[PDB]
Amino acid sequence: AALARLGLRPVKQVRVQFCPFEKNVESTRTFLQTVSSEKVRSTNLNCSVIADVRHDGSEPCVDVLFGDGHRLIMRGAHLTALEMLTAFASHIRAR
Amino acid sequence: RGRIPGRQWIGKHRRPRFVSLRAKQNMIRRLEIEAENHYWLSM
Amino acid sequence: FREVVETQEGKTTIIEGRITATPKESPNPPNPSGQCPICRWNLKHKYNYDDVLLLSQFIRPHGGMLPRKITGLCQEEHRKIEECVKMAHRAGLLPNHRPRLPEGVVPKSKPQLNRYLTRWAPGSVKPIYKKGPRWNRVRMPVGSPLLRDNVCYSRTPWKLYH
Amino acid sequence: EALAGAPLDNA
Amino acid sequence: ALKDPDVCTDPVQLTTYAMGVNIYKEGQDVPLKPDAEYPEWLFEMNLGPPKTLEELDPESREYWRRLRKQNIWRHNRLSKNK
Amino acid sequence: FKNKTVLKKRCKDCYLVKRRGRWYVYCKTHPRHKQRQM
Amino acid sequence: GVIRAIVRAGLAMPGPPLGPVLGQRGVSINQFCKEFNERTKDIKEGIPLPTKILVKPDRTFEIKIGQPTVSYFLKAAAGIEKGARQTGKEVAGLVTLKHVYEIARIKAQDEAFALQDVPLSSVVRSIIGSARSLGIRVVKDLSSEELAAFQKERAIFLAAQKEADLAAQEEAAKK
Amino acid sequence: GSKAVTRHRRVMHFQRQKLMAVTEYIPPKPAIHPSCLPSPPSPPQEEIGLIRLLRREIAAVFQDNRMIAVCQNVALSAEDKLLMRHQLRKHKILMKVFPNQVLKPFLEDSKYQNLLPLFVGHNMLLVSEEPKVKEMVRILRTVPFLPLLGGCIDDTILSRQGFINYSKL
Amino acid sequence: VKTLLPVPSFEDVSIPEKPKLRFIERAPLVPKVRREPKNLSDIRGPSTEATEFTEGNFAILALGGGYLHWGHFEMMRLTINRSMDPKNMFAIWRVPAPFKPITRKSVGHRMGGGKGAIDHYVTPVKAGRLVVEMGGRCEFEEVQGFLDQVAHKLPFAAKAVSRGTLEKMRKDQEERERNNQNPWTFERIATANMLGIRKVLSPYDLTHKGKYWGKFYMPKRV
RNA sequence: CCCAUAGUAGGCCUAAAAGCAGCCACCAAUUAAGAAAGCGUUCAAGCUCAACACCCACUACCUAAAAAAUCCCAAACAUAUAA
Ligand code: FES
Ligand SMILES: [K+]
Ligand SMILES: [K+]
Ligand SMILES: [K+]
Ligand SMILES: [Mg+2]
Ligand SMILES: [Mg+2]
Ligand SMILES: [Mg+2]
Ligand SMILES: [Mg+2]
Ligand SMILES: [Mg+2]
Ligand SMILES: [Mg+2]
Ligand SMILES: [Mg+2]
Ligand SMILES: [Mg+2]
Ligand SMILES: [Mg+2]
Ligand SMILES: [Zn+2]
């Protein structure tokens, strides 16, 4: 539970857009599950997790807006859930 | 610094001895000779 | 393979993944029935640490080792190749594959000692101050015991301890 | 037999 | 000093009213309904020992739950000394 | 560290690692669990 | 935090053991006792009630009171003061499936079963399991004469148990 | 002058030691290692009765219930998840969970082949006998973190926006 | 899907009235006034007694020779009676009480003057004899821990085994002897007196077949 | 590795026994979880395990040391067809 231990205190908002009909959204959905885990959300009540289920067909994306005003974009077309979580934790620690 | 108490090859504690490949081969050769002797005495 | 690029564009970090060309196994293996690439190409018991052209196909660009599941090798061949790769790294047969160094860190000058068939790490073993008697001699290990089953054209078998 | 896929929201 | 209140000891009252159900001071004892007003499954409920694994149908969720509970008991017994 | 012949993990937090040619059972929650192979 | 405990209706007191917990967590013991008594005034005293206390960070408490315990329901229905010691062997009390169904109707109003929306058949099965754990045998039908005979037998058995307890106390005094 | 039985391993005569070395167990060695040879497959055990019951339940649910929707079961707290399940039960939306391994053959061999990509990861079904899409949608919106992965209404596959518009219809 | 499996039928076993091990005396009640020679052949060679299970399902098997005294008996009894379950497990001995007289001379005595006075008693044990046998409504995985502890603390080599483990060990030894690829064997050479090897071998080797050396038994010798 | 609601603090003793000081039972709710396997609390809370779910970890399945006194002790070698 590295993400839960680190917390979402410097994170203003997390948004995950993915098309369930596509097959590359597996890692994005795993990341969404990990972030939406009760412990991670309870670490920081201010942070809100938004889910965008669409049939547009665009590649899945994750946008994280931090309290410092910066943003982190992770495209799940060719990224894994572990890599996305590692980048998220690194950026949380940086901010 | 490496001492064997008393005489090397007699006593409670002895210098260890190890079997060599040529010794094994010689024993096998003699065993084969004696087996052939057994066969020729069989008749 | 797959590559990951991180770009901090306009105070907005973007992480992207791209797919690059990947090598494919050479056609017509001599032994299609084999369950590992080594036994498919009949390289079992027929390779050593100096076969860099074989070792480099199972290692990371920075000198690491690839997973057994990804490579498709069996446990025995995986361990043998890992030992051979360690020996090759210690012998300096893979200059292109070097450990990644953080920016601004320049290694200090160190003495150069050519070596080969290095089983243990250079900075782990202690000097043999007391060799002991002939019947209890402390031998210096040379090579890897896992390669004892390699083909030995010479009549004398490999001496794994000097 | 198999049901048709959901039409895209863009279309 | 704090114990349960006094319980009814009249057999007729116990067999004709739901003394245990009666819990409010203002509310009175609820008379027991007849078999016509009670459902059949209530009288079909098991009152003896739990049904054995052999009795339970092999494809029944009750059978699978019983097998899972037996496996949990076996694991607990194995790990008790461990 | 305490020298031992058979290294064992006194708790789940303990982890085994081979360093300097010897095995070590390291721990952080309970530092007294640290053990060195003899 | 959440504090779940069994509190008898109308018998809340500022003493131990619930009082120290409320004091440690910041809950006003006297205020909790007053509120519990006010909410359980309509309920007969001595009835055990499950109570869930939610403690907010500003040291304010919210109390939820559940339905009375099925053990107490069965004991009151069967006229039992103390349950069977060796359950499954000695029959402390005797109840009917009608009593079980009525207790299931009452207990179905509890939040735990209400949220799951489980059938009254499941509630009845749970009550049957509870009765088996208590030692009160459940029969399909019971008559007044049979219940009176069972009460006489249970009174004789309780007299024997009292004699055994007196003998054990005498042995302990001798020790 | 040691006796025949000693507390320590007595030193053997050299000829006896050579005899012991010669008469050593030589294990049989196959010409080709078995791991480097093809292994015939082993027939798996018969289908579990629980798996068969799950298949029957899935078939019955898909045949009877009209409103069928797939939602990624996010790791909510048990109390809040039970509360949401009770709220769904208020409008007869019975949340169902079945293993993906059991569910896949039914979808592959049934009319729901195109629904296969929607069942990757932790997923549950908000299925009701009658269409209550508006209530389902508002209950989904009550928890923004919990998403709605489209679904299929009355043998008609629809996306999340299709589910949104069906209630408006 | 998790593959549930049927539980064993351990519940069919009935526990006797006395599950725990009985007390073993230091010496027999009747003293022995006849001192005995140091017969070391009673712990030499394969065990000819108590080699099979009788009333239990697990046992402590001895892979070597030695003498068990009151300290070993107390260690075994205390460990088993402390780590066992009286309701589900029962244990019995397979070795008798110490009966063999052992003599010790006074400290500082020279050689000569006569055999010393009796000091204590021991129970001879050979390789292959069960020491303690357990059974009941349990499994070998629940007893192996303390049985292996006792075996390790025993004066000789010992191991916790069950019926299946012992049968598998015997079958593996038989298979090794059957499929051994070495054309020369100790038993054959000793029986045929090849190379005059009986000049250095022992008369007991004709039956031990090179598997026993004093009180030590080598399982790897085929 | 991920998660872990509930009849119920099952009765029995005990000032107190809440799964975890003792005795008996050891059923049952939820598709999914022992009237509790190992920690904890004076007792409760509080923690892992056996649960569900996701999902190829595709575990090795051999055990294991060392220290004396003048100064370690041949030098060396893993590769050319068993003699
Ligand atoms: S190379 Fe053949 S089994 Fe691995
Ligand atoms: K000597
Ligand atoms: K020993
Ligand atoms: K207790
Ligand atoms: Mg000498
Ligand atoms: Mg002699
Ligand atoms: Mg109680
Ligand atoms: Mg208890
Ligand atoms: Mg306790
Ligand atoms: Mg259950
Ligand atoms: Mg419980
Ligand atoms: Mg608890
Ligand atoms: Mg678990
Ligand atoms: Zn530790």
Side-chain angles (χ1 to χ4, degrees), chain F residues 9-14 25-34:
Chain F
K9 299 182 299 179
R10 302 174 62 179
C11 61
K12 59 178 181 178
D13 304 320
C14 309
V25 183
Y26 274 95
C27 185
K28 297 184 178 181
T29 304
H30 306 275
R32 62 177 60 182
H33 295 178
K34 293 171 62 181

mmCIF file of all heavy atoms in Angstrom, chain F residues 9-14 25-34, ligand 14:
data_model
loop_
_atom_site.group_PDB
_atom_site.id
_atom_site.type_symbol
_atom_site.label_atom_id
_atom_site.label_comp_id
_atom_site.label_asym_id
_atom_site.label_seq_id
_atom_site.Cartn_x
_atom_site.Cartn_y
_atom_site.Cartn_z
ATOM 1 N N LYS F 9 13.358 -15.811 10.645
ATOM 2 C CA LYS F 9 12.658 -14.533 10.693
ATOM 3 C C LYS F 9 11.732 -14.529 11.904
ATOM 4 O O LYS F 9 10.725 -15.243 11.928
ATOM 5 C CB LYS F 9 11.881 -14.293 9.402
ATOM 6 C CG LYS F 9 12.754 -14.226 8.161
ATOM 7 C CD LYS F 9 11.931 -13.937 6.920
ATOM 8 C CE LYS F 9 10.896 -15.021 6.680
ATOM 9 N NZ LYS F 9 10.069 -14.738 5.475
ATOM 10 N N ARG F 10 12.075 -13.722 12.910
ATOM 11 C CA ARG F 10 11.264 -13.647 14.119
ATOM 12 C C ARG F 10 9.919 -12.975 13.878
ATOM 13 O O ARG F 10 9.003 -13.142 14.690
ATOM 14 C CB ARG F 10 12.031 -12.906 15.216
ATOM 15 C CG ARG F 10 13.365 -13.542 15.569
ATOM 16 C CD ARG F 10 14.144 -12.692 16.558
ATOM 17 N NE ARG F 10 13.435 -12.530 17.820
ATOM 18 C CZ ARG F 10 13.900 -11.850 18.858
ATOM 19 N NH1 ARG F 10 15.080 -11.252 18.819
ATOM 20 N NH2 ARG F 10 13.165 -11.768 19.963
ATOM 21 N N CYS F 11 9.778 -12.226 12.788
ATOM 22 C CA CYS F 11 8.528 -11.549 12.475
ATOM 23 C C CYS F 11 8.395 -11.435 10.965
ATOM 24 O O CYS F 11 9.352 -11.643 10.216
ATOM 25 C CB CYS F 11 8.458 -10.167 13.134
ATOM 26 S SG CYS F 11 9.752 -9.023 12.601
ATOM 27 N N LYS F 12 7.180 -11.100 10.521
ATOM 28 C CA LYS F 12 6.928 -10.958 9.092
ATOM 29 C C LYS F 12 7.687 -9.777 8.500
ATOM 30 O O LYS F 12 7.975 -9.768 7.297
ATOM 31 C CB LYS F 12 5.429 -10.806 8.836
ATOM 32 C CG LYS F 12 4.799 -9.611 9.530
ATOM 33 C CD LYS F 12 3.323 -9.492 9.197
ATOM 34 C CE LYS F 12 2.704 -8.277 9.869
ATOM 35 N NZ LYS F 12 1.265 -8.123 9.520
ATOM 36 N N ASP F 13 8.016 -8.776 9.319
ATOM 37 C CA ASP F 13 8.758 -7.621 8.830
ATOM 38 C C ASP F 13 10.196 -7.964 8.468
ATOM 39 O O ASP F 13 10.824 -7.222 7.706
ATOM 40 C CB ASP F 13 8.737 -6.507 9.876
ATOM 41 C CG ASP F 13 7.330 -6.109 10.276
ATOM 42 O OD1 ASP F 13 6.459 -6.034 9.386
ATOM 43 O OD2 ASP F 13 7.095 -5.880 11.481
ATOM 44 N N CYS F 14 10.729 -9.062 8.997
ATOM 45 C CA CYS F 14 12.104 -9.444 8.714
ATOM 46 C C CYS F 14 12.253 -9.891 7.265
ATOM 47 O O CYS F 14 11.379 -10.560 6.710
ATOM 48 C CB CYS F 14 12.541 -10.564 9.656
ATOM 49 S SG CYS F 14 12.240 -10.223 11.404
ATOM 50 N N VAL F 25 19.479 -11.339 8.210
ATOM 51 C CA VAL F 25 18.055 -11.127 8.422
ATOM 52 C C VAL F 25 17.919 -9.714 8.970
ATOM 53 O O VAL F 25 18.217 -9.462 10.141
ATOM 54 C CB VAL F 25 17.455 -12.165 9.373
ATOM 55 C CG1 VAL F 25 15.958 -11.951 9.512
ATOM 56 C CG2 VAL F 25 17.755 -13.570 8.883
ATOM 57 N N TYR F 26 17.501 -8.784 8.119
ATOM 58 C CA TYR F 26 17.304 -7.402 8.520
ATOM 59 C C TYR F 26 15.849 -7.159 8.901
ATOM 60 O O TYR F 26 14.937 -7.872 8.471
ATOM 61 C CB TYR F 26 17.710 -6.446 7.398
ATOM 62 C CG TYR F 26 19.177 -6.085 7.375
ATOM 63 C CD1 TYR F 26 20.070 -6.778 6.571
ATOM 64 C CD2 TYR F 26 19.666 -5.039 8.145
ATOM 65 C CE1 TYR F 26 21.410 -6.444 6.542
ATOM 66 C CE2 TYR F 26 21.003 -4.700 8.122
ATOM 67 C CZ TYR F 26 21.871 -5.406 7.320
ATOM 68 O OH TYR F 26 23.206 -5.072 7.294
ATOM 69 N N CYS F 27 15.641 -6.133 9.721
ATOM 70 C CA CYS F 27 14.305 -5.738 10.135
ATOM 71 C C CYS F 27 14.327 -4.262 10.503
ATOM 72 O O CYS F 27 15.368 -3.709 10.868
ATOM 73 C CB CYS F 27 13.804 -6.583 11.311
ATOM 74 S SG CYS F 27 12.096 -6.255 11.801
ATOM 75 N N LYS F 28 13.165 -3.630 10.399
ATOM 76 C CA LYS F 28 13.019 -2.217 10.723
ATOM 77 C C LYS F 28 12.041 -1.963 11.856
ATOM 78 O O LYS F 28 12.310 -1.120 12.717
ATOM 79 C CB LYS F 28 12.574 -1.431 9.480
ATOM 80 C CG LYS F 28 13.578 -1.462 8.342
ATOM 81 C CD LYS F 28 13.128 -0.594 7.179
ATOM 82 C CE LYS F 28 14.163 -0.592 6.066
ATOM 83 N NZ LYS F 28 13.757 0.275 4.925
ATOM 84 N N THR F 29 10.908 -2.667 11.878
ATOM 85 C CA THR F 29 9.959 -2.506 12.976
ATOM 86 C C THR F 29 10.567 -2.959 14.297
ATOM 87 O O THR F 29 10.398 -2.296 15.327
ATOM 88 C CB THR F 29 8.679 -3.286 12.678
ATOM 89 O OG1 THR F 29 8.144 -2.867 11.418
ATOM 90 C CG2 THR F 29 7.643 -3.048 13.765
ATOM 91 N N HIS F 30 11.281 -4.083 14.284
ATOM 92 C CA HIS F 30 11.940 -4.622 15.472
ATOM 93 C C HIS F 30 13.414 -4.812 15.147
ATOM 94 O O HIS F 30 13.819 -5.869 14.642
ATOM 95 C CB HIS F 30 11.292 -5.930 15.917
ATOM 96 C CG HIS F 30 9.813 -5.831 16.117
ATOM 97 N ND1 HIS F 30 9.248 -5.394 17.296
ATOM 98 C CD2 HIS F 30 8.780 -6.108 15.285
ATOM 99 C CE1 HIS F 30 7.932 -5.409 17.183
ATOM 100 N NE2 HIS F 30 7.622 -5.837 15.973
ATOM 101 N N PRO F 31 14.247 -3.805 15.415
ATOM 102 C CA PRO F 31 15.676 -3.924 15.086
ATOM 103 C C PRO F 31 16.382 -5.042 15.831
ATOM 104 O O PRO F 31 17.447 -5.483 15.384
ATOM 105 C CB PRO F 31 16.239 -2.550 15.470
ATOM 106 C CG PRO F 31 15.060 -1.635 15.466
ATOM 107 C CD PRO F 31 13.908 -2.469 15.931
ATOM 108 N N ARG F 32 15.832 -5.512 16.952
ATOM 109 C CA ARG F 32 16.446 -6.623 17.671
ATOM 110 C C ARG F 32 16.381 -7.926 16.886
ATOM 111 O O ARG F 32 17.089 -8.877 17.231
ATOM 112 C CB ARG F 32 15.780 -6.805 19.034
ATOM 113 C CG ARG F 32 14.301 -7.148 18.962
ATOM 114 C CD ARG F 32 13.726 -7.391 20.346
ATOM 115 N NE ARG F 32 13.854 -6.220 21.203
ATOM 116 C CZ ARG F 32 13.469 -6.175 22.471
ATOM 117 N NH1 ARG F 32 12.928 -7.225 23.066
ATOM 118 N NH2 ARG F 32 13.631 -5.048 23.159
ATOM 119 N N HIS F 33 15.551 -7.990 15.846
ATOM 120 C CA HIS F 33 15.447 -9.183 15.017
ATOM 121 C C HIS F 33 16.608 -9.334 14.044
ATOM 122 O O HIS F 33 16.702 -10.373 13.381
ATOM 123 C CB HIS F 33 14.133 -9.169 14.233
ATOM 124 C CG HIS F 33 12.911 -9.254 15.093
ATOM 125 N ND1 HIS F 33 11.635 -9.211 14.576
ATOM 126 C CD2 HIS F 33 12.770 -9.381 16.433
ATOM 127 C CE1 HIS F 33 10.760 -9.308 15.560
ATOM 128 N NE2 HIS F 33 11.423 -9.412 16.698
ATOM 129 N N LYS F 34 17.476 -8.332 13.935
ATOM 130 C CA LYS F 34 18.586 -8.400 12.994
ATOM 131 C C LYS F 34 19.530 -9.538 13.360
ATOM 132 O O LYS F 34 19.963 -9.661 14.508
ATOM 133 C CB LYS F 34 19.335 -7.068 12.969
ATOM 134 C CG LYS F 34 18.518 -5.917 12.401
ATOM 135 C CD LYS F 34 19.212 -4.583 12.604
ATOM 136 C CE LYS F 34 20.549 -4.538 11.891
ATOM 137 N NZ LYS F 34 21.239 -3.236 12.100
HETATM 138 ZN ZN ZN K 14 11.953 -8.370 12.753
#
